[PDB]
Amino acid sequence: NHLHEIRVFENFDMVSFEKGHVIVTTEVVDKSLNYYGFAHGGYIFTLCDQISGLVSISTGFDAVTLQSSINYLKSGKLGDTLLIDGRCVHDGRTTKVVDVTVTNQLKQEVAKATFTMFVTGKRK
Amino acid sequence: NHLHEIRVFENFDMVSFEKGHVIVTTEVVDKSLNYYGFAHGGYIFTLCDQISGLVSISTGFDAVTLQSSINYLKSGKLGDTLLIDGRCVHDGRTTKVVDVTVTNQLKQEVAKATFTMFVTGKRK
Numbered sequence A, B: 001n002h003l004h005e006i007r008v009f010e011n012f013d014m015v016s017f018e019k020g021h022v023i024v025t026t027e028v029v030d031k032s033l034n035y036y037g038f039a040h041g042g043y044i045f046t047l048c049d050q051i052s053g054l055v056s057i058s059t060g061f062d063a064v065t066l067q068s069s070i071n072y073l074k075s076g077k078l079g080d081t082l083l084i085d086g087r088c089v090h091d092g093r094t095t096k097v098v099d100v101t102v103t104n105q106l107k108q109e110v111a112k113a114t115f116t117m118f119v120t121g122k123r124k
């Protein structure tokens, strides 16, 4: 109803984990959805966000996210396989910037986000 | 381990619901958390996003978010009571803009987000 539980990553498949580049798919399920029956904005954002943290790990660093921005282009629907592709855009000393695109099986872009992260330090 | 389920709104309390202004609280629990034991940035954003949709309902409309921006200021921690306050800063015929702030019980800001919405229709 007006407030309800939402879940993210009840399922996933990690397709490729590469330097500054991470691809993961997932399928939209009942608890992915908002009250109008479409994939929830928060759900979509969290897909992007997790992938961006993995991009960040893939360049060697701990880095925390200071700000993000997302555009919602098309609806996610129940049963869609969504492809989440994170790419490092700036791999810096002090900051990182990661772009993420969400895509459906037609390869239409569902959402695009950018995450601006502060480099705390190396990963070991 | 690296990809994992997250849940949002496993508990909540609807504090107030007024024209252009909605307050909800929630308590940070185990499935709110990221690998480091703090509230996940996607869980945080999803709290803001749902509240902004209620703000849009509160001004009498269905709306869909085109774009959001969020700034993370302070970590949420396990057990925290978070207060999510959404306010309509633009209540337009064709667009709505909603600011949401998340604070802890000290009134320290945990995050602030802004949501840019397209009006799809009048409620009922």
Ligand SMILES: [Cl-]
Pocket (backbone or CB within 6 Å): A003, A004, A005
């Ligand atoms: Cl529920």
